């Protein structure tokens, strides 16, 4: 004889929150003959990955110790406090300028959905309000916060 029983089996399948970041250095920065650094130099290329499709540009915030809204600040290591600022910008699908928050504010463009898979951002030079940048090593320690949907 055949006997039978039956059960309903339920399984929980979860999506983790994976976030990756690749930084590719740009060319070294050369000081012009008047003592300025050029503007719009590609300082470096950031690639944000891991995130779920639907992640937006306002849910990404690059912050640093100087805390200047819209700008990352690089500072000399020689104790003289020479600083220049940089912006973080990228391109959307229609090839328009976008930006993530930088210290809590967007510099350019409308809130957008990030490209599927990964999104390239470019660190670009603005300049210094001081001027007269000495030759040397300039540093920033940058936190990238992604608030997952």
């Amino acid at each position: 004889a055949d006997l039978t029983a039956s059960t309903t089996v339920t399984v929980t399948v979860v999506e983790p929150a994976r976030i990756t970041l690749t930084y590719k250095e740009g060319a070294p920065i050369t000081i012009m003959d008047n003592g300025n650094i050029d503007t719009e130099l590609l300082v470096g290329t950031l690639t944000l990955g891991g995130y779920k499709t639907g992640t937006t540009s306002t849910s990404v915030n690059f912050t640093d110790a100087a805390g200047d809204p819209m700008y990352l600040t690089f500072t000399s290591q020689d104790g003289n406090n020479h600083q220049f600022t940089t912006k973080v910008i990228g391109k959307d699908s229609r090839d328009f300028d976008i930006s993530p928050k930088v210290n809590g504010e967007n510099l350019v463009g409308d809130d957008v959905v990030l490209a599927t898979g990964s999104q390239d951002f470019f660190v670009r030079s603005i300049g210094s309000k001081g001027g007269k940048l000495a030759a040397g090593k300039y540093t920033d320690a940058v936190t990238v916060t992604v608030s997952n949907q």
Binding site: V14, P16, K24, G54, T145
Partner: protein
């Protein structure tokens, strides 16, 4: 090129109101060791729940877990409350040197046991209208409706959650299409309605 990464084992935490605690796994996906720093923020991301350990070393390729514990606190019982769990992975001529750190934040959704069912049961209940030059979602449910996909007139709108018993205004057509994110981090089914 420099590589960074932090993986949380889930993409939101459903915290049952008054439960002792929940575990969540943290993974260092990199070739180097890191300090893992975990913090909880209020719904406004201003700096009740305790994370243990608040700071600890995680070796290369290694995985460990945090305990998120409610100690005290009073929350509404007619609706979810929202916090955020942030997990930061702390790594060890004009020359530029920039070091980065990933701070991976997920929703911590405080859920009264008094609430019946889950968001996907109520996801179709959103209504829409245009007012003040904005697309406005109304959420009559007690759950955060975490939109993961939103389309208006065939154009993409960047998502945001809709708080319980409340509204959200999106920047900028009759048809609105949306999907919420379910308790497990998956994109739920498509719903549509015209704006009122």
């Amino acid at each position: 090129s420099k590589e960074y990464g932090v993986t949380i084992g889930e993409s939101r935490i459903i915290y049952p109101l008054d439960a002792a605690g929940v575990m969540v796994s943290v993974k260092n996906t990199q070739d180097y060791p890191v300090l893992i720093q975990s913090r909880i923020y209020d719904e406004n991301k201003e700096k009740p729940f305790v994370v243990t350990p608040p700071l600890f070393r995680l070796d290369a390729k290694q995985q460990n877990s945090l305990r998120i514990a409610q100690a005290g606190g009073v929350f509404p019982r007619d609706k979810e409350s929202l916090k955020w769990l942030c997990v930061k992975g702390i790594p060890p001529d004009v020359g530029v040197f920039v070091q980065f750190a990933i701070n991976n934040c997920i929703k911590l959704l405080v859920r009264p046991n008094e609430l019946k069912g889950t968001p996907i049961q109520f996801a179709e209940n959103l209504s829409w209208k245009v007012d003040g030059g904005k697309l406005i979602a109304e959420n009559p449910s007690p759950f955060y409706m975490n939109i993961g996909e939103l389309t208006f007139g065939g154009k993409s709108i960047p998502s945001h959650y809709i708080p319980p018993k409340s509204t959200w205004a999106f920047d900028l057509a009759r048809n609105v299409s949306w999907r919420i994110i379910n308790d497990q981090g998956g994109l739920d089914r498509l719903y549509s309605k015209n704006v009122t």
